[model samples]
Target: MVNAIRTPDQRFSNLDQYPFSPNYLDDLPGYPGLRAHYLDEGNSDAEDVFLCLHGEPTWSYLYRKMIPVFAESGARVIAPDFFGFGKSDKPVDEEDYTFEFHRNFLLALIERLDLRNITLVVQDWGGFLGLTLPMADPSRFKRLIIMNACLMTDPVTQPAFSAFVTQPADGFTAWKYDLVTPSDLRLDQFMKRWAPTLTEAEASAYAAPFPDTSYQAGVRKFPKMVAQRDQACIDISTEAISFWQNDWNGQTFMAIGMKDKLLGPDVMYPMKALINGCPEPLEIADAGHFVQEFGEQVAREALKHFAETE
Candidate 1:
């Protein structure tokens, strides 16, 4: 029912290292007419489900390296492209891209799929949104794989958090990026800054979602949405802290991309303290914000860690 644009399938054609078949659900209950795209790999009947979530400016493709590892381990891996990213429909209006909107859509997707025994793999905005889900329905999840991201524990009034929205670092803020509007040049620059070793083809896969500036409404709006720090983020994050600290019985695996300027050790260390049994993280010396760029090693190590702990 929302006014939205769908990226053409041709845009995703011939993607370099991503060959997963696309699955679509065009009729999610509240999001009628807006199609959601996901990659469902491995045995559909598998009891272990790895629900991989991507963050801002990225999509399901970001998990390409990790999905196969989880799937081959006899666990089903489901990675959905959030609305306005990847194969999902892009709502054109900035106002349409809201915290509740994205959160609800993810919650609906989980219900529709009837997912259970989930191992959540989250980073960046993915962590912000996906981390809150276990509290919504704790039974569906069993484990968490957290990366370079945080739960907004306070008002976005803190300089550490507020700076992301108010002050532009290195001549780039979400609005500035959205204003220039996601050119291949800018995307390349960004990848180089954080994920310097990405090949051109892989970078193109990240750029594929937005064919033009018009397709970037969600990207432009995400930073603003984060700035608003809705009551939901604070409320759910508070509850989630309790859930992880006192109630959660699942094994946790954390990896840090040390080169990340944001959400690195300084942030993750506090997050480590929040989760009840979270162990010392596997730190990737050279990886940066887009930590999935180094995901193959992380996934292998995570699986090994989980196996040993179990």
Candidate 2:
């Protein structure tokens, strides 16, 4: 059993516009004794599943605005908190969180639930890991809604990918440094700064997961993983590149949080070019790294696009 700590329920009390019920799974294969929290909404038996994956320094809460939109469309919406983020059990040791650890967790969860006919909705680390899932079980994923994310191609190859790992004051270098260096990192303030569109209450929801630094092991580990992309991460992610370019035949909807310094156009446009049939992206001018804050519109627009084609 993995040694982990669960965030107190009170920490999540009365979040803004986040009225969904909590669903837990402590028995997902390979992750023993650690409780994972997910928001399961919409019709359980619906054939269409919108599997929304969130990013670092955020949790299932990031998809609050988009969840309802997908649910209302008669699709099942599942948004889970990564271990150490949101209501999930936080593994005290930072080493417990790895690229494979997070990646495998997604695989295990998908298998456990027997999810199929999925429309993968992702941003940040969500796309970093989620974008690669179809390659393993291509039959399960039928569509993509990618926002502000790219594959973790190793040794920092490609000018677009390398451009992200920049000077301490630019791109994700600054973003990573802000998250890692802060001994007393206030996530609410960080959220407000990164996603300027968040309301006072909405921003505070992002910080609710980690009451203290001890609960932030996952948050701290994510930024580091991007900088130090391991060989396995590189191998899998590199293969995912070829998969999206050639093997993928599903409809894709791309969006860019134009103000996102971390994975904005510089990174996203390269990813768009990689995906064989990704059409022109919807550019949200005011949004930043946490694009889901403006997710309602993105979700609505994506549905319209998919409907037109279908």
Candidate 3:
């Protein structure tokens, strides 16, 4: 059965039309009919290109604060929404989404845009997706600023994800946003502040993409992709770890949020120890999982400092 997640009334024109504002529509060539949307700001020809990537349940909207700030510093910024999220295409069939497929999709985008001399800012699944591109072809990347992200062998190395598999798709959705959001961040301030910016129509637009149990194929499948302990997830992660270990030319900076139960400094610490050239841990105080929300300014400043440092 092809489970349809989005209803007819729920879809929006595109992420570009959202009131939040974005750059232009530049096609990520090899994607064929897919028009990969990105935020291209500052001098289009700037030598330093900052590639920003977001994870699940959020879009480039998370980096709304950092775009203008980085542009003023003469850095060009580019943030793309993955296939199922943000302004990009969301195929109703979750079956279409896969680790290798998404990785290749992003690689096609990077090459189509011809981006280079880059400093990558990645969080959540962004780490999982973006690291593989560089592993396949390292020349496109200059440095990496990794946050609470991981590239691990699925079933063999990660049993933590099994918890997500047993639940109903709708139940998982409710738990992630409704239960986890309020419990994790204390909804008082966030609800009061950010909720105003999102209208019922807008919220529904975001929610429309995932209609019911049948429509959640992509969301349900993501955890399974990461949990695969067999060769696929493990082999790709091993290669990435190897490059990060032996390749000495570029830099890897860590600016992690401690309170992030999902992806926090606890994960970052061991990652720091594992990467060969990495010597110190980059930690921020009084920050949580959505560090980009509470500590956007801090992260922006830290990224700039790390980019300029030796």
Candidate 4:
């Protein structure tokens, strides 16, 4: 049994600009007693489903701007907070957070929900994990909306990631370690670096999940989990590249946040080359790593492109 702590519902109360109701699944097969939270908005029976996944230090809240837009365009949007982020049950032990553990959780969620006709909206770790899912069952997915993310398993990209992995823990890691002992870690400072225009309320919303540091085991574990060299992640990513390049028969819409120092145009251009028939991306020059901060415009443009193709 996984010992987990559920954040009090009251802690999530009155989050600004995040008025969506939470949906819970406390009894997924392998995740017994651990509740996962998600935002299931718009038509439940809609034929097309937009499965939005969030990366480290963020949750379903990241998709707040895009969810409504996709729903308005008549697609069901399902955004789930990973096991240790947002409203999901947090396992206190950092050891429980592993690449396979998180990957299995998502695979179980997708199977349990039986999600289909998926248009994946991914960024950050979201892209890392979500990009691997279609290989589990390709027919279930139909489209891709990639932003500011890449498969870290690629040989070309693995070197830099490996270097960072070996370096001394960065500021985020330092702050997260402090969280375990109970102290304030200013999320806004981190937010401003990537998403400068975030309103005070929005920044607060991003920080809401971790009322204290104990709830941050998942956040703390994510950076270290980026697999370097030819590990399971690299293997899966190589396979995913093959699937996208050869087996995938879906429309793809890519949006690049040119200003994002990490996974911006330089990284994405090669990724685009890997995806079969992927066209030139719609570039958002001013946005940073958190492209979802500018999600509304991206969503609108994606919908327009889909409409044009249809």
State which candidate has the highest TM-score: 2
lDDT top scorer: 2
| lDDT of candidate 2 over 208-286, digit per residue (tens) | 9988998998999999998888889989999999999999999899999998878888888888999989999999998
- Enumerate residue pairs that collide in model 4: 179-213
Per-residue lDDT tens digits for candidate 3, residues 1-310, read 2222222323444433244434433434434445445678778899878788877656676666666666777888888877666566555665677776677777876776789978787877788777666767778788777776766645344433333333445333333554223323322233223333444444444444444434344544565565443466567876776777686367667777765555555467766765665546557665555555543564566566665775
TM-score of every model versus the real structure: 0.92, 0.97, 0.74, 0.91
Model 3 spans with C-alpha error above 4 angstroms = 1-30, 154-217
What lDDT is reached at residue 51 by model 2?
A: 94
Better of 2 and 3 by lDDT: 2
C-alpha lDDT score of every prediction, in listed order? 0.82, 0.90, 0.60, 0.81
lDDT-sorted candidate list, best first: 2, 1, 4, 3
Q: Report the Cα lDDT for residue 235, model 4.
A: 82
Encode model 1's per-residue lDDT on 1-310: one tens digit a residue. Answer: 8999999899988697898999998879889889999999999999999999998778999999999998999999999999989999999998887777888899999999999999999998899888888988989989899998877656442334444444445322543454345443344445545577888888788778888777888877776666567777677766777877888889899999997766778778878888889999999998888889899998999999989998
Off by over 4 Å in 4: 154-184, 227-230
Of the candidates numbered 1 and 3, which has the greater TM-score value?
1
**How well does candidate 1 score on lDDT at residue 25?**
85
Candidate ranking under TM-score, highest first, comes to: 2, 1, 4, 3
Model 4 residue 49 lDDT score: 95
